[PDB]
């Protein structure tokens, strides 16, 4: 009677990327005593949010879905809760639209996120990004910076590293041990073009690492196993890594 909206019509809104079904729905959520965090909006199997549908179905990286969603959780005072909104299944677990935003390869995108406070240390430990028999699921490290490195965009790790809300510790570890370091190590594949853009962001990695806190030497770093990111190389077999590693100690005493 006044313009009521349930879940499957706000995501169908979002996906054909329609905006006069949304303004209505701000009202109904502002008169119908819920947030937009409540579980009759998630994917009962995997917590699918809309935001997320709204990160998966993206129109040429653009959408007004996601700025008008992030003023009504601004105005609802659930912001923080749904731009960190994590998935709940056992495939996808731990993934928020920070990862999407990052996979998808969107400057903008990161940018609206981490300035509207999205967690920089997300973890996304599920079945998919871990190792297995076969397809291991293209394990990246399990966190943005991380991922941020191992997917060639060196802007969006300075942007993670340096942003004005919350920087990324870059001395982090994922739940299996690996740091940013150790992904970009498991994430070489011995060719020519890969070995080169893995050194190019290492020597990178190290000079910011260097710069923004020069105590810390993650080179020394160990995972879970007690080893080193040249024993990880040594122990996978990465020679051009393990090159790289010991042309760089041998370089620049300090």
Request: net charge neutral; with cysteine.
């Given at each position: 009677?006044?313009?009521?909206?349930?879940?499957?019509?706000?995501?169908?809104?979002?996906?054909?990327?329609?905006?006069?079904?949304?303004?209505?729905?701000?009202?109904?959520?502002?008169?119908?005593?819920?947030?937009?965090?409540?579980?009759?909006?998630?994917?009962?199997?995997?917590?699918?949010?809309?935001?997320?549908?709204?990160?998966?179905?993206?129109?040429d990286?653009?959408?007004?879905?996601?700025?008008?969603?992030?003023?009504?959780?601004?105005?609802?005072?659930?912001?923080?809760?749904?731009?960190?909104?994590?998935?709940?299944?056992?495939?996808?677990?731990?993934?928020?639209?920070?990862?999407?935003?990052?996979e998808?390869?969107?400057?903008?995108?990161?940018?609206?996120?981490?300035?509207?406070?999205?967690?920089?240390?997300?973890?996304?430990?599920?079945?998919?990004?871990?190792?297995?028999?076969?397809?291991?699921?293209?394990?990246?490290?399990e966190?943005?910076?991380?991922?941020?490195?191992?997917?060639?965009?060196?802007?969006?790790?300075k942007?993670?590293?340096?942003?004005?809300?919350?920087?990324?510790?870059?001395?982090?570890?994922?739940?299996?041990?690996?740091?940013?370091?150790?992904?970009?190590?498991?994430?070489?594949?011995?060719?020519?073009?890969?070995?080169?853009?893995?050194?190019?962001?290492?020597?990178?990695?190290?000079?910011?690492?260097?710069?923004?806190?020069?105590?810390?030497?993650?080179?020394?770093?160990?995972?879970?196993?007690?080893?080193?990111?040249?024993?990880?190389?040594?122990?996978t077999?990465?020679?051009?890594?393990?090159?790289?590693?010991?042309?760089?100690?041998?370089?620049?005493?300090?």
């Amino acid at each position: 009677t006044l313009r009521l909206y349930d879940r499957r019509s706000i995501f169908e809104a979002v996906a054909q990327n329609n905006c006069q079904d949304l303004e209505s729905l701000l009202l109904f959520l502002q008169k119908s005593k819920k947030h937009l965090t409540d579980n009759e909006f998630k994917d009962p199997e995997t917590g699918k949010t809309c935001l997320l549908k709204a990160m998966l179905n993206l129109h040429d990286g653009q959408n007004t879905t996601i700025p008008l969603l992030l003023e009504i959780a601004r105005q609802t005072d659930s912001l923080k809760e749904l731009v960190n909104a994590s998935y709940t299944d056992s495939y996808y677990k731990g993934q928020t639209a920070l990862h999407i935003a990052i996979e998808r390869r969107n400057m903008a995108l990161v940018t609206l996120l981490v300035e509207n406070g999205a967690d920089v240390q997300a973890a996304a430990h599920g079945d998919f990004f871990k190792k297995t028999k076969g397809r291991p699921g293209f394990y990246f490290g399990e966190l943005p910076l991380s991922l941020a490195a191992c997917t060639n965009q060196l802007g969006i790790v300075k942007f993670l590293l340096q942003n004005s809300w919350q920087t990324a510790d870059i001395s982090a570890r994922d739940s299996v041990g690996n740091t940013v370091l150790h992904a970009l190590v498991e994430v070489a594949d011995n060719t020519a073009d890969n070995t080169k853009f893995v050194t190019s962001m290492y020597n990178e990695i190290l000079m910011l690492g260097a710069k923004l806190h020069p105590t810390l030497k993650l080179e020394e770093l160990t995972n879970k196993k007690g080893m080193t990111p040249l024993a990880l190389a040594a122990g996978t077999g990465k020679i051009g890594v393990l090159a790289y590693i010991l042309q760089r100690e041998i370089q620049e005493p300090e």
